[PDB]
Amino acid sequence: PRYHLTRQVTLTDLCQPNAERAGALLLALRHPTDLPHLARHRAPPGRQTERLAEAWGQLLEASESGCARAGLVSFNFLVAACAAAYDARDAAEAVRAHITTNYAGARLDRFSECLRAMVHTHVFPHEVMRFFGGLVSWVTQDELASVTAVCSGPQEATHTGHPGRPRSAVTIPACAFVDLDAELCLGGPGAAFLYLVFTYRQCRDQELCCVYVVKSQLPPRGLEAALERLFGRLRITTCTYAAFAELGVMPDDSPRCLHRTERVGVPVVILEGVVWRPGGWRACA
Amino acid sequence: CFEADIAIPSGISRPDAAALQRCEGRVVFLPTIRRQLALADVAHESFVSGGVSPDTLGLLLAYRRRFPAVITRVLPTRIVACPVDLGLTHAGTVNLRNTSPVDLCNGDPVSLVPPVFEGQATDVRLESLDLTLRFPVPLPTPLAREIVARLVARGIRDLNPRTPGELPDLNVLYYNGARLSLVADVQQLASVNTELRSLVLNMVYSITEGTTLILTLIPRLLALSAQDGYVNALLQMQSVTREAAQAPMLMQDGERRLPLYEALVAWLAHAGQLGDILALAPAVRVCTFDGAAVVQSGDMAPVIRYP
Amino acid sequence: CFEADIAIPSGISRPDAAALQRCEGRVVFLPTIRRQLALADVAHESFVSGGVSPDTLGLLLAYRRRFPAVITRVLPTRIVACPVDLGLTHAGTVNLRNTSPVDLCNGDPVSLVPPVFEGQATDVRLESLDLTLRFPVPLPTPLAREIVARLVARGIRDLNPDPDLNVLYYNGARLSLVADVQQLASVNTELRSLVLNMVYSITEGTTLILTLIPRLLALGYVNALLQMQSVTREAAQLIHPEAPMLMRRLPLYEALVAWLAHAGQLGDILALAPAVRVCTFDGAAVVQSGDMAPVIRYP
Amino acid sequence: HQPLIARDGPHPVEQPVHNYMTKVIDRRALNAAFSLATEAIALLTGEAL
Amino acid sequence: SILSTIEVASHRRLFDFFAAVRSDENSLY
């Protein structure tokens, strides 16, 4: 009834919502204790199936099940994680400077080795880490993080956007100029859809990752017309690159911005007025 | 709902105001998400691309990247519409007007089709401002997927006209009886080619390394249609599979890779969802509160969200 | 919530009064959304359509047809159940009853068919009025779409016999799918309906394009772009199927329509669309089997 | 109590029953409705006058 | 008094539209 709330107790090895902002696209970490088994299948046996067991085993070594299963990869954490991956330098080192000063970069290097290894053994980081919400509060202890991070569609950014104007409320930072690929260059006035897009390419730049957002007044069923375009990475030859899940709707087209204010100079985008229509992933070819 | 107002521009002829009075519950294709819009961007002149108007395949191609909305209220200066793709978040259950020869059901998923029958023209005329409004035809999703497959193969007949000039129709549809006639007029090349490419593309990705294991079981089916009644109706009379029998090849990479299990999901992901790539996506589900089990041709149906 | 009231029939036995109490939180498929509903309309005998009790094919048609409903409160002479598909998105939090997988903090459960597990499990049968309630199984979408392709693969090995497919390890779960003693004789005979579709529409799908592409690309942009993607991937298996098997436009074009509708139905029959979502608050977010989970409306 | 007739004869003294008959109620609903439009809610309430 | 009936009618449903439809403790004006 245009109001909902979430709350989950996780650890501070990942996102660490103290150094993060009030606006944070918290993704999950779906099933860490999984993938010795499905990493073995869903791939040819000439893919070295023990790789996600070891590289994530190094990532858990970089810091048992505990009283909190490993969750909450931020959207901050992924920008540095593919910073060497997408073809953009000096705009990607700033967010990595935001993490190695305020979040240990060993947790980045073990994770980027997993990002190559996830696409190596064909078990992609999508259908992993579903969207979680918008981080209203962080009541975090020394080891824990009990974040109220409301899911459930349109109201989650309006309940953090109606009282936003006074002081500092959510504002939902896109957190990179290279990310938030704001589409409709050939565009006019209308309410746009937000998506969460992961592009892929097998053995070109060695199972490459790119983590960013697109903004379009295009349907998710017509987005594949544009997602098949706009890329040079159509030359795998197997398949299933360019996954996307709908982040929802931006019903204020003028409200996209360009700024550089965070924490370390981190280039950023204010996104005023968001529907968080949570959607699902869509990856076939 | 995100109520979208469509401005009724200039004058209005006294029957042209009544033209909008009978359209409460039809479907507006609007090529944006607006809170304010003028009427000419909706009309069939706005469907017209560079130079030509689209044919019955290109209309779906126009309808694909154009967002459906339903007329909810009728005012002489505005037409308050509700965008189904977004604003279907209702405890209000926006109604739909059946404009078809077809009783749907209570609960069938409903998608939209252009006017493609001989008597269901539905193109209204406005003498004040010369606009045509071909309203789409809300139809059940087994019926719509049975329509679109007819036009595609007829367009492939328009590619290569070998045999002499006595072809079968692909102009005859049956739905609970009811020999329905389509409109077979003109087939535009690009509207064929864009629809032809996706069908050939999607069926190639439906064959994986473990797919040819299923091809081994072709004489297994023909033994079953000789001694089972369910199989006999399943292998139809005009089937190419019955003509096909007129092959394991182990070659096992690793010998544990789940060879069937990848061939099913990939077939389910690629050639299974042919109804989403040829036609529009289903979003309309018939939800009758008072206990009506059917929705007659010309009646109203309260509508809830995705199937 | 517009909670539609299912009417209990007239007086039942005292164990039948206690049995319907422990169904508080199961999934119920109501055909119409009248505020007064009988209980025989709810029961599995109302799913009898072709003069037979249906298989998992006939259930998935019926489950893709009528409207889901979670039992809210069980009352004397009444069942108060609010349906899922009415209401706006993410309103009306209510409880599901878990079944053996975990159902984490999100995951979008699917009310999918009861015979995916042991055959006469959860079949609440009232001895008094003599009906049957077969409650469906609420599993999440990647665990839904995996298993429903996993069981149809197993029937192929039984359809013509000579690795065990049924492992499917989850995050904490070693999913024992095999009920070998008496259920695999009864679960395999119920996918007899669903397998023969899945075999046919593949073999009608592959063998159509195996005689389409030799008869096409021979009379423009179709030839350029499609072969641009299938450079020695599908062409490698084109020479493989045409040689290690057998090889008329008008039978083919009349078979083009017939497969595509039938292949189109399996996209709605299978693939298990997310009905509802889990999104928890003030909760431990990792749900035990047999524990109530807060569950909200739209994907 | 059912009508009895005092009976003669060499028969066994036939079995006498004088009981309370139990019966089964049915429940019937008799549903009825009436619509009320989008007017007469802004009206009748002072909301639109 | 067309003007004085106009302004007072606005001043009524301004306050009675926000929160005054429910009866209060005892006296409201």
TrEMBL record, chain A:
Disulfide bonds join 82-209. One of its GO terms (cellular component) is viral capsid. Transmembrane segments: none annotated. It comes from the Viruses. GO terms for biological process: viral capsid assembly. Keywords: Capsid protein, Host nucleus, Virion. GO terms for molecular function: DNA binding. The keyword Zinc does not apply. This is Capsid triplex subunit 1. It comes from Human herpesvirus 2. The lineage of its organism: Viruses, Duplodnaviria, Heunggongvirae, Peploviricota, Herviviricetes.
UniProtKB/TrEMBL annotation, chain B:
One of its GO terms (molecular function) is structural molecule activity. The keyword Hydrolase does not apply. GO terms for cellular component: viral capsid. This is Capsid triplex subunit 2. Disulfide bonds join 1-82. The keyword Membrane does not apply. Keywords: Capsid protein, Host nucleus, Virion. It holds the Pfam family Herpes_V23. It comes from the Viruses.
UniProtKB/TrEMBL annotation, chain C:
GO terms for molecular function: structural molecule activity. It comes from the Viruses. The keyword Acetylation does not apply. Keywords: Capsid protein, Host nucleus, Virion. Pfam families: Herpes_V23 (PF01802). One of its GO terms (cellular component) is viral capsid. Disulfide bonds join 1-82. This is Capsid triplex subunit 2. It comes from Human herpesvirus 2 (HHV-2). The gene is UL18.
